[PDB]
UniProtKB/Swiss-Prot annotation, chain A:
It comes from Stutzerimonas stutzeri. The keyword Chaperone does not apply. It is an enzyme of class 1 (oxidoreductase). The lineage of its organism: Bacteria, Pseudomonadati, Pseudomonadota, Gammaproteobacteria, Pseudomonadales. Nitrous-oxide reductase is part of a bacterial respiratory system which is activated under anaerobic conditions in the presence of nitrate or nitrous oxide. Ca(2+) 1 binds at K397, E412. It catalyses: N2 + 2 Fe(III)-[cytochrome c] + H2O = nitrous oxide + 2 Fe(II)-[cytochrome c] + 2 H(+). Cu cation Z4 binds at H437. Cu cation Z1 binds at H269, H325. Belongs to the NosZ family. Residues 485-581 are annotated as: COX2-like. InterPro entries: CcO_II-like_C (IPR002429), Copper_CuA (IPR001505), Cupredoxin (IPR008972), N2O_reductase_N (IPR011045), N2OR_C (IPR034205), NO_Rdtase (IPR023644), Nos_propeller (IPR041114), NOS_propeller_2 (IPR041142). It is found in: Periplasm. This is Nitrous-oxide reductase. The gene is nosZ. Cu cation Z3 binds at H73, H376.
Amino acid sequence: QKIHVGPGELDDYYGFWSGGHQGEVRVLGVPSMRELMRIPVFNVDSATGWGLTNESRHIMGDSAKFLNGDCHHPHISMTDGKYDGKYLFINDKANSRVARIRLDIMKCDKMITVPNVQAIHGLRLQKVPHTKYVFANAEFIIPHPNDGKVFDLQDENSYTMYNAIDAETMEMAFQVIVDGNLDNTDADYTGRFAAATCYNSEKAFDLGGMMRNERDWVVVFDIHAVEAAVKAGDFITLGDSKTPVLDGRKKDGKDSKFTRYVPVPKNPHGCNTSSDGKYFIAAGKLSPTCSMIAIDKLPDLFAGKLADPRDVIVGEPELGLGPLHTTFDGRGNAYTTLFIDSQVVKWNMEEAVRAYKGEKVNYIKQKLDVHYQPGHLHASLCETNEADGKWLVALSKFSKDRFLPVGPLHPENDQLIDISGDEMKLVHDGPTFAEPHDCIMARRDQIKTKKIWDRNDPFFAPTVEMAKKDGINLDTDNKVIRDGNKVRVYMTSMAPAFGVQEFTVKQGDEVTVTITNIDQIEDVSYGFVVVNHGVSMEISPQQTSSITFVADKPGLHWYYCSWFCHALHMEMVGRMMVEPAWSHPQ
Amino acid sequence: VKESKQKIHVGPGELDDYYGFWSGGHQGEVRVLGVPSMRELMRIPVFNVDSATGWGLTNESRHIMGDSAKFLNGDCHHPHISMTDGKYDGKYLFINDKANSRVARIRLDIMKCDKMITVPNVQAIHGLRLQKVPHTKYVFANAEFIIPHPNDGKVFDLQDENSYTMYNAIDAETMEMAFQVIVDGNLDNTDADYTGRFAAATCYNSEKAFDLGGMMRNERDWVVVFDIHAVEAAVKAGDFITLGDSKTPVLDGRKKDGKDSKFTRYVPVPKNPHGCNTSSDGKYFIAAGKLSPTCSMIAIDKLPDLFAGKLADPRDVIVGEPELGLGPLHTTFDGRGNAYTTLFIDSQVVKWNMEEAVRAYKGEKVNYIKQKLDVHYQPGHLHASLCETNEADGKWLVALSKFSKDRFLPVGPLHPENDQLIDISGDEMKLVHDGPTFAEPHDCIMARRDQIKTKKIWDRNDPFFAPTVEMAKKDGINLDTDNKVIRDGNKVRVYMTSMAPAFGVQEFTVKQGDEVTVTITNIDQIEDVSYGFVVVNHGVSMEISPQQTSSITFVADKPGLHWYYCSWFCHALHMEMVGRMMVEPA
Ligand code: CUZ
Ligand code: CUZ
Ligand code: CUA
Ligand code: CUA
Ligand SMILES: [Ca+2]
Ligand SMILES: [Ca+2]
Ligand SMILES: [Cl-]
Ligand SMILES: [Cl-]
Ligand SMILES: [Cl-]
Ligand SMILES: [K+]
Ligand SMILES: [K+]
Ligand code: NA
Ligand code: NA
């Protein structure tokens, strides 16, 4: 298996890295591990103008006021248990959002603030029959309502909820109140069941209390029961949100019909569905084990045919210190990160199941040292029934001496490991910024991207509607529209000239500049920057972009094209002239 | 015969040989790479807002940024490392912001931006380079765009006698303005000699036009040479004016009715010249011809005669004008007597011998061109290791090309730049690595591993957060031990230590509308154990590395219980390293 990609060779897989608390998504080439693109999501990107342009702020909605995010879990939409390459979704733990990236244009095209929750952490996608729902965990217990009258996590109205977002429309589908809290989550290969780990069964706020119980649980959701109750109208709503809310809590030891709670030690973390669909596998973290939930025993569990919820556990292998996450090679082996032991341990799932029944068998196959303290890990296509067992990425949290010193703040170390053979082989150390937690890989042939924007793309359709209200045809017009103290400039662009090279406004006017790149040549992107006004954005071929700013400074103010586009790039400029307020009324 | 056969692979547990400091381009940051692996080791926020570390949100960063903290964007091009005696001394990195007219300084011991200045009375800081000898006393910065003085909206004519741009000198150590020199025309790139007396800058708009054709009209623009000693003499003697409300000494470097200033000479050079590069032997300022398929070589040792009036014609300091190819933009040096120039149109790097080009200029029939190497595609800057020092070592060359086209996996309409590593250690340039990068780094700079010395943990007296230490002192707080909430009207100042896995203050209560400052001191002494702080749904995020104090201010505008958490995976109990802010209503 080739590990080095030379000049003119292409990578075999795409990798989509979370940006961690930096807030973007990063597109890597695998196995070269080089970053091919950055996709801004919750960060403000000076380069493309994401967070500054009207198109991006419209997508972000009211949350456009935040300049930060904290993202952990990117996942690719699926059809029948295989990636279909349409969308990537990812969480924001810092401001409680889910974002959708359209994989044809590699941009964030939708974003939602999950109502009535704090901190979206775990996120995974329904597999079968396709990604109808995005499942998302709200991690922190809060009062409901959270109006500052009650603060006690022990109140009967303090809780967190499990969230289902409609993948296609990116609106809330439903929420399920749970006991405890929620950490990570995954879904089965039938569409009936999802599952989530919980570490705060104690509903405590301090360290000791959160560690009190020897077992917390994996909570299992019967999605068929939730849907049926939603169609029957058997639900409530919270606050101002119309989102159907179902109660998945136990009431006096009686299970709800939407959930079952399977006791699992201890403050368990990762929750990973095996690629053969047999198991939800929960990483024990404080317990040196993983717990294997047999998915084909879940119907019986939900029909009362099992005396004890532990009866769906068919394995609990002892692996090592600090198990956090598990992935799959498609050959019947599972790979689990041991954070404290700083290793990846490869183990055979059916043999672990044998050992649970007593048939003493050594299910552990290999322990590979990693550098150092691994969190998530990801084997190529591991979330699909096409898991190909070629590559494994272990994403470690301390790099220490593995890279040149760069000051007190160190990079992370995401290590590429060959798993095509029987022995795991460490091949490459990839330093990364801001702590990617998880990543997802896809074959090169599973992703199909556009090289030119479509002119009706919804990303900027609101801007086209604006232009229409002004009588503008964006493909041809270079016009300055005046409207009271608003000025709407529309121009085309074709290197090395802006279609409008100067315009005049009044001091204090609110200026919107809308630019359509009418070039057809791939890779010929233009930019637009207004000097000393904090204005910057990208316009790629056939895209329309716009940005609004206040002309608060009189005098002559240059704008220029930021994207090197032509030998005469330095000369693709224009001038905004701002007439002073003392020469205009008031 | 010596062949180019340097190793390019840096396997797990091996370390790179050189640091690379990349401009972040339109994205606004500085990036630290390892060479020859070309992996990004660290991101240093400068003009961007970084969600991960909180640069742009924290009080320490907004203090350094000053009033320009209101801007969320920057546009970088030219990173340069301070020198002593014509060799890198590893103290500081400087870089420009073309979008909002700033210069920033990065301290290479902590790899943080520690000072920032908005250059007064100019628009668009583009070209930037450092004094070399006797050390980097001055940062030289080009303001690209001609503007009226005053720019108060009375006069817009760029042909007005008070419309001009200025060459800028910043005190490298204080990061205060040293002086400004008014020039004719505009300014593109700049470099400095090896004595400290001279600096030079290309100018592409000798015609002071606003339109593309207008600024290409002159057969020749020029490189303007500055007699820095003479400027210093005038400043020391008080022979200067000031502009507007800036106390910066302003000297007039324009021609006056054909009469030369004492501070400048204009050397005619074809045509819209771009790069301005000092050869590592100190003999030449080399201007890349852009529209002219040439470079022009100015003999620095003829400049004293030029300013003394001994030379008949300013063209007499031109000692070579080799013809290289279409679209010369920039030049670098191997320390062996060869120059290497990017050919933007021909899409090549051309290697040529400077002394042979000088002899050809006299009429000798000698081919100074050694090799043309195809690059992919349209190169702008290029950089050979240690090229800006008298230690130029002739080992590595990076060419930073603006169109990557098919050299990487497609990632949608926006493509990465292609920064290509080229082995120049031998007689033949050899292309060895294609490096995709985001947002158009324009230029980069390499330093030997042993030229950079970094801190492993913060010093408690570090100037970076000295203002915060001063605030704490006013509140009577010992930041190394104290965990306290100070109430001051509707202001609340929380001070806490932190030690994984617990915040030193795990809950506090405020009134709705209070302005909350949270100051956190990481008292861990273990390298790499960084902590974070995020307030859920409040747009609040920051890094606290070992022995650092960081602080951030936000208004508690939402009643209820609001969780905060450590964003930096730091401990097996990371998930449980949390606290609660309780906000009382009404
Ligand atoms: Cu957010 S947690 Cu193991 Cu996923 Cu990193
Ligand atoms: Cu700003 S220009 Cu050839 Cu330096 Cu990139
Ligand atoms: Cu348009 Cu560069
Ligand atoms: Cu503190 Cu993770
Ligand atoms: Ca627990
Ligand atoms: Ca010109
Ligand atoms: Cl997981
Ligand atoms: Cl240059
Ligand atoms: Cl040579
Ligand atoms: K880390
Ligand atoms: K580009
Ligand atoms: Na939305
Ligand atoms: Na300053």
